[PDB]
């Protein structure tokens, strides 16, 4: 019943003391933190506490949208040699640093996921040519579904896939995705392997990655310019912003101290130094 | 009155009994006691096998040594108990398995000895690689060092042999072996054996995972990391030595999907 926006426990006025009770003495061998408050050690007056923990609630701590990835696509001229650039990105929070570390404060989580799409385009070649306002399809390809090989192949029919046709210039795109995990919680860290190396099998056949569950965990997004070739080249950058809503978490873990290296927990050399120089007897 | 103390503890599981006269109470991880799967959270349809007394008993892992040189030590559960009586037998015989533990670490000395050992319990204790070229490259055979377990190192030394990698964990002590400052290791359930005070660490651990029951062969639930917070010191000596012994007891263990035995390639 104690909500987030509740006033914190008050400070009780306590006077001088000379008794056989020892708030001050403990033993951190027990693993337990000694739970004291100012009054326990020094004389205090009465204080009606006003501050609340309101903002520090798990839900509020993740209430911000965050850039997960930057997908780049383009629409070149018809005569061109290179193909029209259409991107495919494996949906994961671990491509960027910020949001990841925040999510790493715990062992597991559940959250309905909100994605936002900020598209931004421009020309590239020195020319005064023209491009009419461009549209963009963002097709979510769940694991196993046919990944588009061309920018104009059958896959874009999306008879079952959930897509979003964004018209450039209008407000950023947004879609809601519930907790879609195969487990009873999303796993930030997975101490194990997908395969088991059997003895009646060759090492190769039984080998897999350390820390990985399913290579394809959530699927890929596919983004393409819908409008056809235009004599003047136009490149586009779609920025995805994720805001984890309705979030729950379990078992806290120490926050990442050294820079990330790969999708794993691994650390690169040359970054193994986080704390600076400070003399013990210097304030 | 009758003389009941926090230091004096007698734990009993099956046909094994652990006593102690210098304890510092006991730790129930996240306040939850280990338990059997409730119909509400059940997942596999078959009748689960609960070995009970057959597997729910203390198993002593070979004793390691502590010297001024020691950086650290680590194990994985259920991994560590992979070859402990029926628990292992049952473990290898089923596709799924969930178990909790009563971890008791033993390390005594004299009132003239000094130091501190932090036995940490980390659910999903992922450790870091040894290559500056290949992420997440530690091979299964090095990921699961059984009852002998592993250690922590004082320096990160990359593996350069790209002709045949060493594929092991290089878990830097101060980084708790996972890129985070050791000083924060207390967020995990823990006890610190500080020689002058106690002589043992008892950490009861419930089953913790993202799934109700999971493949034990493939995945380790908990992690037991022991690193000397205070280095070992004895008298005016240059080479002191005292042993550390780990006895872990699986609790409320249940296994589903009975099939032929898995003979893993451990070497």
């Amino acid at each position, epitope marked *: 019943a104690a909500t987030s926006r509740d006033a914190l426990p008050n400070t009780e006025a306590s006077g001088p003391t000379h008794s056989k009770e020892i708030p001050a003495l403990t033993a951190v061998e027990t693993g337990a933190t000694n739970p004291l408050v100012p009054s326990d050690t020094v004389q205090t007056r009465h204080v009606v506490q006003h501050r609340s923990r309101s903002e520090s609630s798990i839900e509020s701590f993740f209430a911000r949208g965050a850039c997960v990835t930057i997908m780049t696509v383009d629409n070149p001229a018809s005569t061109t040699n290179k193909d029209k650039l*259409f*991107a*495919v990105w494996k949906i994961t929070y671990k491509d960027t640093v910020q949001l990841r570390r925040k999510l790493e404060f715990f062992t597991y989580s559940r959250f309905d996921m909100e994605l936002t799409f900020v598209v931004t385009a421009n020309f590239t070649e020195t020319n005064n040519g023209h491009a009419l306002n461009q549209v963009y399809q963002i097709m979510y390809v769940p694991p196993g579904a046919p990944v588009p090989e061309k920018w104009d192949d059958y896959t874009w029919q999306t008879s079952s896939n959930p897509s979003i046709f964004y018209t450039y210039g209008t407000a950023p795109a947004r879609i809601s995705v519930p907790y879609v995990g195969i487990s009873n919680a999303y796993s930030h860290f997975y101490d194990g392997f*997908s395969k088991v190396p059997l003895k009646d099998q060759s090492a190769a056949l039984g*080998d*897999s990655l350390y820390g990985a569950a399913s*290579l394809n965990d959530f699927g890929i997004l596919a983004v393409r310019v819908v409008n056809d070739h235009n004599p003047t080249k136009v490149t586009s950058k779609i920025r995805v912003y994720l805001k984890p809503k309705h979030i729950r978490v379990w078992c806290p873990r120490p926050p990442r101290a050294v820079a990330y290296y790969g999708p794993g927990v691994d650390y690169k050399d040359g970054t193994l130094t986080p704390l600076s120089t400070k003399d013990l007897t210097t304030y | 009155a009758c003389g009941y103390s926090d230091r004096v503890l007698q734990l009993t599981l099956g046909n094994s009994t652990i006593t102690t006269q210098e304890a510092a109470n006991s730790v129930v991880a996240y306040g939850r006691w280990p338990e059997y799967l409730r119909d509400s959270e059940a997942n596999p349809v078959d009748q689960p096998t609960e070995p009970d007394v057959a597997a729910c008993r203390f198993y002593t892992l070979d004793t390691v040594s502590w010297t001024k040189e020691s950086r650290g030590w680590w194990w994985k559960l259920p991994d560590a108990l992979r070859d402990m009586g029926l628990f292992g037998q049952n473990m290898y015989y089923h596709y799924l398995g969930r178990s909790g533990y009563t971890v008791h670490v033993q390390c005594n000395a004299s009132k003239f000895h000094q130091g501190a050992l932090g036995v940490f319990a980390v659910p999903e204790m992922c450790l870091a690689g040894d290559s500056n070229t290949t992420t997440m490259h530690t091979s299964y055979q090095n990921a699961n060092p059984g009852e002998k377990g592993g250690t922590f190192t004082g320096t990160f030394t990359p593996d350069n042999n*790209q002709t045949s990698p060493a594929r092991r964990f290089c878990p830097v002590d101060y980084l708790l072996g996972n890129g985070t400052l050791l000083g924060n290791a207390f967020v995990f359930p823990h006890q610190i054996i500080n020689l002058r005070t106690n002589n043992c660490a008892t950490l009861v651990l419930p089953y913790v995972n993202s799934l109700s029951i999971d493949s034990m062969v493939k995945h380790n639930n908990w992690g037991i990391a022991i690193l000397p917070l205070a280095p070992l010191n004895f008298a005016s000596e240059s080479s002191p030595e005292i042993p550390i012994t780990l006895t872990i007891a699986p609790m409320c263990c249940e296994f589903n999907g009975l099939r032929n035995i898995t003979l893993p390639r451990l070497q």
Partner: nanobody
Framework: QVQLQESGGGSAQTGGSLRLSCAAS????????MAWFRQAPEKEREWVACVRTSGVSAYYADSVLGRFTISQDNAKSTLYLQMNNLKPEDTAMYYCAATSISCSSGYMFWGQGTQVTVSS
């Protein structure tokens, strides 16, 4: 648009050697593996060999052991399959399956493949 395009041909005499290449693009998130697969004329698709992300740690198929060599050049973002001692069993199509992996089985990107023929 992770474009995987094989090359290397396939029309050698029995016993020779060929160099099977594969141009990779798009976003190959290094970490994982990169490999080779064969379908054969009339058999099931079979795994040939897999090499680690950037690491030169690899394995080979029992059938091809030592007679096939799979490397990489992540500077050139390519993978190579040198094949010495080609034989009548090696006559088949070869595919550069280099994406995700994590092991020697999972994929989200394949190529168009190329045929090899060891005649005699």
């Amino acid at each position: 648009q992770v474009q995987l395009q094989e090359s290397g041909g396939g029309s050698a005499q029995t016993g020779g050697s060929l160099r099977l290449s594969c141009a990779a693009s798009g976003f190959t998130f290094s970490h994982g593996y990169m490999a080779w697969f064969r379908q054969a004329p009339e058999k099931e698709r079979e795994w040939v060999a897999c090499v680690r992300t950037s690491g030169v740690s690899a394995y080979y198929a029992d059938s091809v052991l030592g007679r096939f060599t799979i490397s990489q050049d992540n500077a050139k973002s390519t993978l190579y399959l040198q094949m010495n001692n080609l034989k009548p069993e090696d006559t088949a199509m070869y595919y550069c399956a280099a994406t995700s992996i994590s092991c020697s089985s999972g994929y989200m990107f394949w190529g168009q493949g190329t045929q090899v023929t060891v005649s005699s």
